[PDB]
Amino acid sequence: CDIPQSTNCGGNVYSNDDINTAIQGALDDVANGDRPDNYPHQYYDEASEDITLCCGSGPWSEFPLVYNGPYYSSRDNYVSPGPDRVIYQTNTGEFCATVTHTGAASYDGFTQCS
């Protein structure tokens, strides 16, 4: 669906530009064969997490959502992905949701950014 104007991931509020930058980064990094710290990852629906997607069918991917992005890390300069993620449709790039580890119900779980 359209990228939202903003999203609140456990207190980190991001803009549409931050979200777009994250997806664009993921797509470029996959194309470049240089997936920073091996992101993107696959995202699977796990309904206990109460995360709605607005993009349609999977497959879905997730990539770190950061300020002043895109997220990048390398063997010579590790950077944490932090807690926040964009979810997008792997085959197209289209936006699905933003999620976070912050405040999730279980270890390594995600919860929806609001």
3-state DSSP assignment of residue 87: strand
| Residue 50: contacted member of ligand 3AM, Ca ion, none (CB under 5 to 8 Å, by partner type) | Ca ion
Cis peptide before 4 (omega within 30 of 0): no
| 108 marked as binding residue | yes
Is 88 among the residues that bind ligand 3AM (CB under 6 A)?
no
62 is catalytic: yes
What gap in Å lies between CA 15 and CA 10, rounded to an integer? 14
Q: How many residues bind ligand 3AM (CB under 6 A)?
A: 11
Report d(CA 17, CA 90) in Å as an integer: 19
Among 50, 67, 74, 114, binds Ca ion (CB under 5 A): 50
* Count of helix runs (H) and strand runs (E) in the chain: 1, 7
User: Exactly one of 17, 34, 46, 50 binds ligand 3AM (CB under 6 A); which one?
Assistant: 46
Residues comprising the binding site for Ca(2+)?
Answer: 29-32, 37, 39
Which residues participate in catalysis according to the annotation?
Answer: 41, 62, 101
